Write a protein that binds this DNA or RNA. Structure first.
Lengths: 248, 240
DNA sequence: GCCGGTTAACCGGC
DNA sequence: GCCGGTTAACCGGC
């Protein structure tokens, strides 16, 4: 993680910091971005801003196929790149904006290594509700592609969690948390199928005691994923079928 | 439906105006004034007219309807903690966007929006599960003629700085062929369609609709289960 | 504590 | 034309 060495720096900056009251705390992410662009400026990219960048760097490379070759990475191409029609229709006069379904919130790159940082926010006033982290399915392909292409030391997926509460007309940061996905026990990940199949947890609750290699983590997760999938399917007959079979 | 017989009306005062939530509530308020509520406004109302009772079990009986209880009501806690000084604020999880009631009959109007600019993506309408429980609750309690769930797609496009409505549709869920409904499990188990595409060729009774939908649901459930294996299992076995 | 269902929509594959 | 994943997080049952 490029952000860890100065996490403490951030915690101090964000704790206390306030924002406008109209996710709910989307402002806080901006602050986090703003901050990063000030201390790790030559590393910081909103996801789309990296695509725009890479395509300006080679204007004689047009069409999707050619543009896709510019990633040097099947895994990354899969996590970061936009559609084939979207990549086709890219131009200086037609840059990428934000995309709702996009993988990361913020991207930290340095010497071909990539940290993909999601910035999650939380209303601590209300009852804890573990948010969607990432698609269990998307993560699955990610792991598969990692294995197939030998890409084991190219990129990390990390999260920052900004805790806030309602205080008058503005909203304030009470605390934060930081964790790294590939440093958690894969088989302890909670997959909520019904919830668009998303792994779920609060960052402060994520464990960081994985011991093996990156490649072990992927196999281990794929193992857990496949296993949760086998079990989810049977559990479906009982929840959504059985209880209703009488009425028909 | 109380909306249909003035849909034409509505349609007129919407095309041309200027992700983005378009009122519609305002209008419904003016015309059929007494019969419209922004949902929670109804709850507050329902409770404000009965200050005589507190506690959640006592207040859940103010629905006099197992089935209505299920869709409109808030959890035991928030109910209990309801006072004329601590009313309900907007909650995202609320079923209806707008609620019209009359003669002890309820129309649950939902207001969808669409950007004709971007390519068509059937929006989540209602949860397949939530709908199955409803049908289940209708039957058990023979509540077949009490409520409708209808919709009102509002289409629009951007123009320099402002978004303009370019048309509106309207459909009735309980007039659609149940077996035609798309249940996209991955999308939180939601029914997916655009209103202007919802078929309306159903003619059977209400009890028949529900019975049918439970058959549809169950079928698509077994179907979804099996297909998890070939999508989420087979493809990764090779890695472990 | 433990657990999992909802809202709003929104892209892109072949 | 046809088909289905994704993002933001969110409440309340027992």
């Amino acid at each position: 993680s490029f952000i860890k060495p100065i996490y403490q720096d951030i915690n101090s900056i964000l704790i206390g910091q306030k924002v406008k009251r109209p996710a709910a705390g989307e402002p806080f992410e901006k602050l986090v971005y703003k901050f990063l662009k000030e201390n790790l400026s030559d590393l910081t990219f909103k996801q789309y801003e990296y695509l725009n960048d890479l395509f300006m760097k080679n204007p004689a490379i047009i069409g999707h196929e050619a543009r896709y070759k510019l990633f040097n990475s099947p895994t990354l191409l899969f996590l970061l790149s936009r559609g084939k029609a979207a990549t086709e229709n890219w131009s200086i006069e037609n840059l990428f904006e934000e995309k709702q379904n996009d993988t990361a919130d913020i991207l930290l790159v340095k010497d071909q290594f990539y940290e993909l940082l999601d910035v999650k926010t939380r209303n601590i006033s209300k009852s804890a509700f573990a948010p969607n982290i990432i698609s269990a399915y998307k993560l699955a392909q990610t792991c598969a592609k990692m294995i197939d292409n030998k890409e084991f030391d190219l990129f990390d997926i990390n999260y920052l969690e900004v805790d806030w509460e309602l205080n008058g007309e503005d909203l304030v940061c009470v605390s934060t948390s930081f964790a790294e996905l590939f440093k958690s026990e894969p088989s302890e990940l909670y997959i909520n199928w019904a919830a668009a199949m998303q792994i779920q947890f609060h960052v402060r609750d994520l464990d960081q005691g994985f011991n093996g290699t990156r490649e072990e983590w992927a196999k281990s997760y794929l193992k857990h994923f496949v296993t949760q999938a086998e079990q989810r399917a049977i559990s479906m007959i009982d929840k959504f079928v059985k209880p209703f079979k009488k009425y028909i």
